Design a binder for this molecule. Structure first.
Ligand SMILES: Nc1ccccc1OCc1cccnc1
Ligand SMILES: [Yb+3]
Ligand SMILES: [Zn+2]
Length: 606
């Protein structure tokens, strides 16, 4: 059972297909049209069914060419309002019908951000983007908003003719709109059954440039050249992923580089990955995020978590594949470096939440919990740590990669639970059951806190990071002079980042140390978002007032929650910036992403 959804479950009825016909109204900030759901009964004598909705206005529901009865239940907070539809004729098991629903979205749709021209790069046109994961599809259209159901889709999207629509689907042509010549209709087909959280739409002044045999990069014209360079490893990564995961089944792999308020590093929307412009470091150094989104083309999009309680399946295996891709490109030592960095991030999350907190369990119980509130690094890094531990228990990366490929093959086009995964692990490694039985399953899967066992990590790339961090931590005032720019000479951007991560784990440091750090290392000059993020957190937590306008600027000039949330929290926790932090949030709140605005609000207790 999916406790995040109010719809009839998959055991009752299944959506097989969505035909979406809609128009994007920028003057009203509404999407208006029809969602025609092809629904298959899983039961005898089915006479009603329920769909998820959230902030939707329903005009009518048509089945067999006539309007039918429906009712909207009371809103259940973040879950939205259940919509019960009265079938005109009782259905037998496996019978299919088409239910056509006329709806309009609200300007406040938690799935959508509507941007004014001023919020864009070009300053001439408005822009719209969606983000359905986890349970925001119901805020665009009535559906069974649960990843336990997979459907294909087709769509026709009418937009102002000077703008471009793109979806998580194959582009299927464009024509002028016969109902309004100031508009174009863009068409889309997704022939691979997907969970509805992977439905995606962007509308904006978009341009494209090809960067590989199956990849266009899309963005506003101002960002096209930089993006094309930043993401040029994309085809190489696809070829590696295909080798590890089996065939890429989605046809194209395009990239869309969003405006700065996109709330995540990326979103694995099929055919069209969405990414933050905060990846544009200029040197490809944040490309692990592309590797990660590419990996979702197998783990997540082919094999899918049945409910959000099992989100680690999606994320753990994806981080696992992600790190293999980068290990193939840059070496096994770098894979170990990133793996160990991940353990560090998990230490951070568990410390932040508290070692007994329910959100530090690998498998979580989301009953009455908003998934956006529960979201963290835990499913990513605790999930990865389990897989990395298993890899080491079961004979190493070659062997475990054989399991991963078989697992993808076994569960493609399906939605699964942790028990499904574990059953298959035991099946695949049947001659190593003795070794599998040594695993503390109850702790790994169901207990809060750090895992019961830490994997073995190569230290080669990490040692210099730890060494330098420890010099700074143990330094007294008379040691500060010995620091110099040459300390960084042999460190990659990755290692600088890990140096800062190490030091941040011990923050605050004395203000004089941090001032010295800026003096000799000039971290203020670094535009790498990951590095700049940790550096500003270190400065604010160490009470450097000079850093306040810098942290405020970063927190607001982009909206990636990974960065915006902790910067606002740090600013709020520093007495000198507290008031300005709260004021800045209040002033920006209406023009922020609705999920981000909600969460920063909660973080700031505002
Ligand atoms: N959020 C979350 C936390 C712990 C386990 C599963 C989860 O899934 C819900 C989710 C996923 C992605 C984005 N937003 C919410
Ligand atoms: Yb000394
Ligand atoms: Zn992911």
């Amino acid at each position: 059972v999916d406790t995040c959804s109010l719809a009839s479950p998959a055991s009752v009825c299944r959506t097989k297909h969505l035909h979406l016909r809609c128009s994007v109204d920028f003057t009203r900030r509404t999407l208006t049209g029809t969602a025609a759901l092809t629904v298959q009964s899983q039961e005898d004598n089915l006479r009603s069914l329920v769909l998820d909705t959230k902030d939707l206005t329903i005009e009518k529901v048509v089945i067999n060419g006539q309007e039918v009865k429906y009712a909207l239940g009371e809103r259940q907070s973040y879950k939205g309002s259940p919509m019960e539809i009265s079938l005109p004729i009782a259905l037998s098991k496996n019978q299919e019908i088409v239910i056509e629903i006329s709806f309009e979205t609200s300007p406040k749709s938690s799935a959508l951000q509507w941007l004014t021209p001023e919020q864009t790069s070009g300053k001439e046109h408005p822009y719209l983007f969606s983000q359905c994961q986890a349970i925001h599809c119901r805020a665009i259209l009535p559906c069974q908003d649960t990843p336990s159901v997979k459907l294909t889709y087709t769509a026709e999207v009418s937009v102002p003719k000077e703008l471009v629509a793109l979806m998580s689907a194959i582009r299927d042509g464009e024509t002028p709109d016969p109902e309004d010549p100031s508009r174009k209709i863009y068409k889309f087909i997704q022939k691979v059954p997907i969970p509805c959280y992977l439905i995606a739409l962007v509308v904006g002044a978009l341009e494209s440039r090809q960067i590989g045999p199956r990849t266009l990069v899309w963005s506003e014209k101002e960002q096209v050249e930089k993006s094309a360079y930043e993401f040029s490893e994309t085809e190489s990564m696809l070829k590696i992923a295909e080798d590890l995961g089996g065939p890429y089944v989605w046809g194209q792999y395009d990239l869309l580089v969003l405006p700065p308020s996109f709330p995540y590093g990326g979103m694995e929307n099929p055919c069209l990955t969405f990414v933050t412009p905060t990846l544009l470091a200029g040197d490809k150094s944040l490309s692990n995020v592309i590797a990660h989104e590419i990996s979702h083309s197998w783990t997540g999009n082919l094999v899918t978590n049945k409910t959000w309680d099992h989100f680690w399946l999606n994320e753990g295996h994806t981080v696992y594949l992600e790190r293999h891709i980068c290990g193939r490109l840059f070496g096994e030592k770098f894979r170990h470096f990133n793996a160990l960095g991940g353990w560090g991030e998990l230490q951070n999350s568990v410390k932040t939440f508290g070692e007994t907190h329910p959100f530090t369990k690998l498998v979580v119980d989301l009953t009455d919990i908003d998934p956006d509130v529960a979201y963290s690094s835990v499913p990513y890094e605790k999930g990865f740590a389990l897989l990395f531990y298993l890899e080491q228990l079961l004979g190493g990366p070659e062997i475990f990669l054989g399991f991963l490929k078989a697992y993808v093959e076994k569960f493609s086009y399906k939605s699964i639970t942790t028990d499904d995964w574990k059953d298959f692990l035991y099946s695949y490694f049947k001659d190593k059951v003795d070794v599998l039985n040594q695993v503390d399953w109850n702790a790994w899967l169901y207990s809060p806190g750090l895992p019961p066992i830490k994997p073995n990590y190569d230290m080669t790339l990490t040692n210099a990071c730890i060494a330098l961090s420890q010099r700074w931590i143990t330094a007294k005032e008379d040691d500060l002079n010995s620091f110099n720019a040459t300390d960084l000479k042999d460190l990659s951007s990755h290692q600088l980042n890990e140096f800062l991560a190490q030091t941040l784990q011990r923050a605050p440091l004395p203000l004089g140390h941090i001032k010295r750090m800026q003096e000799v290392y000039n971290f203020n000059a670094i535009n790498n978002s990951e590095i700049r993020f940790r550096w500003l957190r270190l400065c604010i937590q160490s009470k450097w007032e000079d850093a306040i306008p810098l942290a405020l600027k970063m927190a607001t000039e982009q909206g990636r929650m990974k960065f915006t949330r902790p910067l606002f929290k740090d600013l709020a926790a520093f007495d000198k910036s507290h008031d300005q932090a709260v004021r800045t949030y209040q002033e920006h709140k209406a023009s922020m992403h609705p999920v981000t605005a909600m969460l920063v609000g909660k973080d700031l207790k505002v």
